[PDB]
Amino acid sequence: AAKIITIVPLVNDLDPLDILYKLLKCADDEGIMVQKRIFNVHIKKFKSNLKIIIPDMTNFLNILDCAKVADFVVFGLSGVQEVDEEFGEQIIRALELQGIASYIGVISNLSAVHEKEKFQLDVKQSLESYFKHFFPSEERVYNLEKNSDALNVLRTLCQRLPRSINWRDNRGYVVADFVDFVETSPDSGDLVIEGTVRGIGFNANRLVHIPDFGDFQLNKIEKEERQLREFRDMEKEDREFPDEIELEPSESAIERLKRYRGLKNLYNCDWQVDEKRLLRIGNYKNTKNRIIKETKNEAQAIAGDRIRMFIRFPKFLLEKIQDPKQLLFAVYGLLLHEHKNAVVNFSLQRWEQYDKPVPSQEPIVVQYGVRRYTIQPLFSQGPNNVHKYERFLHPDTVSVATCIAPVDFTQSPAIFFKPSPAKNIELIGHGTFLNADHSRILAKRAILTGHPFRFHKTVVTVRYMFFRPEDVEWFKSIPLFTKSGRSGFIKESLGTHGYFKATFDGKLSAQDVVAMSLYKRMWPMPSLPWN
């Protein structure tokens, strides 16, 4: 069974094939050297097989995807060019946040630094400290031009036990060496795949996932600036006045507040899980552990088995499949029921240095594990089982983004992004799949404020909350409060423009602000896959 190595140059001045040559050369075997993008090589020197993947370096997602399947990631650093904040640095961060196995840093490049040798070494040392910043396990950064440093790296790749990646190792996966098709019906056929099994294995009675194609059945197994400023302005509004609603004299409160219900305090909410065909799960923690135990047991092809895998595959997709020795063709097992949609909950924290606002309900993409979906999330905070909906992702804390997507039964890392011609993509967030839990109720608050201005001992009279008597009358029965902590109730309508009379606990002043609080139940939205 081969160790999967992928080479990731963190600077565009580095040629990935140069790193490969230097690594291969320090095995005295000119029968390796003469030998488009994914290579199987024997190392008769450490008696080891390596499968070396060079991603398409001009596609961020392809990079991420080669790194997923990797046992070792070899990072190329540059002696003369700085790592780019917007590209290579982001590769480092995306690589860790999605889950990375083992990793080693190299320079293929030192001689390009045309300065005294104390200087060159101190550039290496500075690369070692930039690297240690992200990968503390990694003291040294290996000079691939010094033979004995090249040999070190090679020996490690061949012999050292790889680190593990939870989400991908608790499902099965395979990197395809050969891919061929076979007709069986007019509309479809068998996509035949050859590779070594990794992970927990495969069972023919299960589904299989190919990015970016979808889920498939197994037959058998053989051995721009405009939108920004508007969202920015709404973010500022919601920020200064949450969750205020300002009625105008012209409009109807009955019609504006149409889906809202009376509710002061959020711990007193007694909404059921009623109606606005999804999977619902008793306890997520337990069934997760049942499913993984189950699939491990029922597996028929086990890590290290050479496999011929027949996948029920439609013909119109054949056009999109490209050479498995040039781009990566990988196949991930799905666990029981990961095909089925459910009310799902991720966690989410802004990316480093991400300024732009990220509002609820807006098209965003998640990668979680290997899957990628366009979701429309509802944000809220970390109680009594109901949570305050927040219209915008808060500034500097972790939130819960809930929606309807297919369940994940590892607890895959999550990375959130939009497309944006940067590196054709815009990285906005990161977190992990927490949950299927349709008991999480999302409630959106609305605050109406009014000004008390006449005081007859017991009775205050208030204006500019409502602007029509018939609005005052519709909402008569919702409790009032003041930000100073008093509690109240509307007595009667007063006049014709929404003045009302209200009685309260204590005495109020004309500095006091009286308010009314309403909540609207917020329903998780559906999502669809992304390619």
Numbering used by the authors: 82 to 116, 121 to 308, 465 to 517, 527 to 632, 636 to 674, 677 to 786
How is this structure described in the published paper?
The fully assembled 90S contains an unprocessed pre-18S rRNA, U3 snoRNA, approximately 51 assembly factors and 18 r-proteins with a molecular mass of 5.0 megadaltons.
Bms1 is a GTPase and associates with Rcl1.
